[PDB]
Design a protein around this ligand. Sequence first.
Ligand SMILES: Nc1nc2c(ncn2[C@@H]2O[C@H](COP(=O)(O)OP(=O)(O)O)[C@@H](O)[C@H]2O)c(=O)[nH]1
Ligand SMILES: [Mg+2]
Length: 164
Amino acid sequence: MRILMVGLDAAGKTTILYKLKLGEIVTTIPTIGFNVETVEYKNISFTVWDVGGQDKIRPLWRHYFQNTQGLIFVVDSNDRERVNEAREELMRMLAEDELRDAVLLVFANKQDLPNAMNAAEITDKLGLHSLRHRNWYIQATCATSGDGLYEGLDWLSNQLRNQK
Ligand SMILES: Nc1nc2c(ncn2[C@@H]2O[C@H](COP(=O)(O)OP(=O)(O)O)[C@@H](O)[C@H]2O)c(=O)[nH]1
Ligand SMILES: [Mg+2]
């Protein structure tokens, strides 16, 4: 099954995967620049990738959103420099029908980081403090140890299957 674990560059995508261990990741280069890591094997299927509009205008993203039922948002809580880079992509995932119920799994790892915004504004400059109604979920995620990952994956799985 497919859950699009979206996230910026160096957020934590490869680590989470390092744990799950869906087998050496085939990191090929589809479009001049746009790389996608089809980390899809067995029950789990993660079409890995990064942000960037929608490549050099190709309907592959749409076909992903259409068939996908999952939604794992990994927010480099630290990257406070490009902060809105997510909001920019998310911009489309706003109205999009294909991904209505799809539970957005806000894995907010890298919060305790000295660089990142102070403790309180952690969930501020993100916009997840006021944005409600949308289907989402956010718990303290520690990929290194493994914490955060459990509650997230389980909650998502249950919600999606149960909601319908
Ligand atoms: N200090 C520390 N480093 C992290 C954290 N989690 C992962 N990183 C490291 O940051 C780097 C980028 O993560 P990576 O998995 O390669 O990200 P991806 O590029 O977005 O797939 C790797 O060197 C990770 O080990 C964390 O919260 N604390
Ligand atoms: Mg990669």
